[PDB]
């Protein structure tokens, strides 16, 4: 009766079902957990918001087209305006979180295409000016739930001031490595003939026990079309990709007034 | 007359010392001394002060 294809995930007041899964990835074989006393750093009693924040938040959907080059998000950036998770994140200097990432893309037995879904620790990307190095604005680095898109062309700016965004070049994974090697990162593939969802469970990953969520994204989420969407009756068809992410084992230190980041 | 002592931990055991000279002045650094009594400077008071009690009663 039980199947690798059929899964239920419940966190807080939120449940996901899938009937065409392909198992689930636990990044580096490690389930998220709270911070042990023997690895702790800040000494204030932490906030552990539990069910208020450790629940599935659904981002705005994106459209997969035959011409799409792919999508990226950063975490915790993508969830910074998500209910009580966002409030706990911005009221504290320090935060740590694991995640359940659930990527959703259904089609038909007549559609074809394959998405690589990668969770990348410290997903540092190239800037779009050759007048400077490491020259990216906070606003362009932290787009929130809208995330960004890859391109198949690199066109760095004439002026340094116009190039303060990522050069998200698909085949170099936006960071000067070949995309074919992205499989060294925790991943699943949504191959439309096989599965309609990817599930990745991510522990907290950093060189520290806890860090400044508003300064530092721990994970990149990359969705690359490895094989282009094709549908014989309409080559111009679009199918949605929906990203749903639950924080897990969230812990916050250094309470004060709320952080309100620059928007320009 | 080899002394075997604990090393200071690094990124990821013991070390051996033999004194070669007849004068202690020739010796390498004194071993780590973690002794301390801050109270002789931070609280040099004649009558005990209990933190939870009033300083002046």
């Amino acid at each position: 009766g039980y199947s690798d294809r059929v899964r239920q995930i419940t966190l807080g007041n939120s449940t996901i079902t899938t009937q065409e899964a392909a198992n689930a990835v636990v990044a580096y074989g490690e389930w998220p957990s709270y911070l042990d006393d023997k690895e702790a750093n800040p000494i204030d009693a932490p906030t552990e918001p539990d069910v208020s924040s450790n629940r599935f938040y659904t981002l705005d959907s994106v459209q997969w087209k035959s011409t799409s080059r792919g999508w990226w998000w950063k975490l915790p950036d993508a969830l910074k305006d998500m209910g009580m998770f966002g409030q706990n994140m911005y009221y504290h200097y320090l935060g740590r979180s694991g995640y359940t990432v659930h990527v959703q893309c259904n089609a038909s037995k007549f559609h074809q295409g394959a998405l690589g879904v990668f969770a990348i620790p410290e997903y540092v990307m190239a800037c779009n000016t050759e007048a400077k190095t490491s020259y990216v604005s906070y606003v362009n680095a932290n787009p929130g739930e809208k995330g960004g898109v890859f391109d198949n062309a690199y066109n760095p700016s004439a002026e340094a001031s116009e190039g303060r965004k990522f050069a998200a070049l698909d085949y170099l994974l936006g960071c000067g490595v070949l995309a074919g090697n992205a499989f060294v990162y925790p991943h699943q593939i949504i191959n439309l003939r096989t599965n309609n969802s990817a599930t990745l469970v991510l522990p907290y990953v950093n060189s520290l026990a806890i860090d400044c969520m508003a300064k530092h994204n721990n994970w990149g989420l990359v969705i690359l079309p490895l094989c282009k969407l094709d549908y014989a009756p309409n080559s111009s068809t679009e199918i949605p990709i929906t990203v749903t992410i639950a924080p897990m084992f969230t812990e916050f230190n250094g309470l004060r007034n709320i952080t309100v980041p620059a928007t320009q | 007359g080899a002394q075997v002592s604990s090393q200071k931990v690094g990124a990821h055991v013991n070390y051996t010392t033999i004194n070669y000279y007849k004068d202690s002045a020739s010796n390498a650094a004194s071993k780590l001394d973690f002794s301390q009594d801050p109270s002789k400077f931070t609280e040099p008071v004649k009558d005990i002060m209990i933190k939870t009690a009033p300083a002046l009663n």
């Binding site: 009693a45 | 008071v45 002060m49 933190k51 939870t52 009033p54 300083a55």
Partner: peptide
């Protein structure tokens, strides 16, 4: 020998007032 660990503590509502002192004492 290590620098001081921090113990688990909650709040108080008490006649014990460790926040007040008198540095006139020389402490």
């Amino acid at each position: 020998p290590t620098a001081q660990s921090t113990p688990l503590t909650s709040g108080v509502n008490s006649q014990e007032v460790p926040a007040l002192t008198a540095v006139e004492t020389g402490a």
